[PDB]
């Protein structure tokens, strides 16, 4: 049983030319990688190589206009980069961003291919920039291409179109791009837990509410778990996994689990304001490993406290290697869970 790891310092080149201390920092990935080496997890993993996604692979989820626009930034002067970035919600662009977004997606392709062919059981991808806010036709929320959504489509393209892909997005923000790419799809089950605050938290859309259950034959395959009024932590996430995530996922019976593993719900995060501990992330990973015969690919999304993300992701990797989990309710969190249960009981007999 082998755990894969992909990391490439070339993804550090994407940077914010006007604010070098912007929280989506190059050192997010180098700090996480360093922590894996300090905790001796690195030596226990099989290094999987990064690669660039092809433009053909990007078109599995994105429009040729969007691909062309981001590609065009590779050679722009600073004023053109500043103006292009301002055309999106919460995006900065440098001459290296496009290449970095290709390396993030291609890293996860090589990881998924390694998992699906049996070279490894599971894998962790320490990649930048993030992916889950990227839409088919636009960048958003520090994300250019939807790495996790592309990986699901990539996985199906090397196996069969009906490969059941579960994407669990525990980034504190709603993966709006992912939700929309798979909204009419019952082959990819999208489950997101996110701070919502009645729609006032980023990305600021009612799309992220519990009543958005999917469209068409995707009805029931989009599970939104939104948190309101409370600084949520391990009890709230544990309970949502026990009551919702794990019962639905078991019924779906995925053949590969992608985690959109943002760590901005972590204790200490400057954007999330939540308090999931590193031990909590270990328990969420350990639960997901009981699906798909442990075929889990943990993909870095957000997470902006360098110490918190480095400890939290390392614990997820520790779980992937087979380590036993370390030892571990707000009233409004019960309201949320009950609201999602009512919305999804019609499509999931486990509920």
């Amino acid at each position: 049983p082998i755990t894969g790891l992909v990391y490439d310092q070339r993804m550090m080149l994407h940077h914010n030319m006007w604010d070098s201390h912007h929280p989506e920092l190059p050192q997010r990935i180098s700090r996480i990688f360093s922590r894996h080496e300090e905790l001796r997890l690195l030596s226990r993993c099989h290094r999987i190589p990064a690669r660039l996604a092809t433009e053909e692979e990007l078109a599995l989820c994105h429009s040729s206009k969007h691909i062309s626009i981001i590609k065009s930034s590779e050679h722009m002067k600073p004023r053109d980069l500043n103006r292009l970035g301002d055309e999106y919600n919460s995006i900065f662009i440098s001459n290296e961003s496009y290449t970095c977004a290709l390396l993030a997606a291609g890293s996860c392709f090589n990881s998924a291919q390694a998992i699906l062919t049996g070279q490894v059981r599971n894998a962790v991808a320490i990649v930048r920039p993030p992916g889950h806010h990227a839409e088919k036709d636009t960048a958003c929320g520090f994300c250019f291409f939807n790495t996790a959504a592309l990986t699901a489509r990539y996985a199906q393209s090397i196996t069969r179109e009906s490969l059941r892909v579960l994407i669990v997005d525990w980034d504190v923000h709603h993966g709006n791009g992912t939700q929309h790419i798979f909204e009419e799809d019952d082959s990819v089950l999208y489950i997101s837990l996110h701070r919502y605050e009645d729609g006032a938290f980023f990305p600021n859309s009612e799309d992220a509410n519990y009543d958005k259950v999917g469209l068409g034959k995707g009805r029931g395959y989009n599970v939104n778990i939104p948190w309101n009024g409370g600084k949520m932590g391990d009890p709230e996430y544990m309970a949502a996994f026990h009551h919702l995530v794990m019962p639905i996922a078991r019924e779906f019976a995925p053949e590969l689990v992608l985690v959109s593993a943002g760590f901005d719900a972590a204790r200490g995060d400057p954007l999330g304001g939540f308090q999931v501990t590193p031990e909590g992330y270990a328990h969420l990973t350990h639960q997901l490993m009981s699906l798909a015969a442990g075929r889990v690919l943990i993909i870095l999304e957000g997470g902006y406290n360098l110490t918190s993300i480095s400890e939290s992701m390392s614990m997820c990797t520790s779980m992937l290697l087979g380590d036993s989990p370390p030892s571990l309710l707000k009233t409004s969190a019960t309201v949320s869970i009950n609201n999602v249960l009512r919305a999804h009981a019609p499509f999931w007999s486990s509920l």
């Binding site: 919600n89 919460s90 980023f202």
Partner: peptide, 8 residues
């Protein structure tokens, strides 16, 4: 997403 303005 970052700034404090409300919809970023």
């Amino acid at each position: 997403x970052y700034x404090x303005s409300x919809r970023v």
